[PDB]
Amino acid sequence: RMKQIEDKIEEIESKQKKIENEIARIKKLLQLTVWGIKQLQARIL
Amino acid sequence: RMKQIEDKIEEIESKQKKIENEIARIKKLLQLTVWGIKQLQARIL
């Protein structure tokens, strides 16, 4: 019961890293869409 | 002490599913804002 609970946590920790890395990419991806939004504004208005 | 630790993990796992589903929707939502950004560029520049 102990060991399996430690294995549950490894999984949780593993999935959490995945989450954090994806979020990092989402934030940069959002940085880029912001640039484009603001760029299109300059040309046009 | 064992049982409550297993209940903590159920919660954690539950909140983690919520997180992953929200992120899925955020990625598609970002796919859509990308389309619109690029579309507006074509018309204008």
Binding site: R25, K28, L29, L32, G36, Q39 | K27, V34, K38, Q41
Partner: peptide
């Protein structure tokens, strides 16, 4: 805008 576009598919 190419860097912008290269980066788009890059981080996605």
């Amino acid at each position: 805008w190419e860097e912008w576009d290269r980066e788009i598919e890059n981080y996605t």
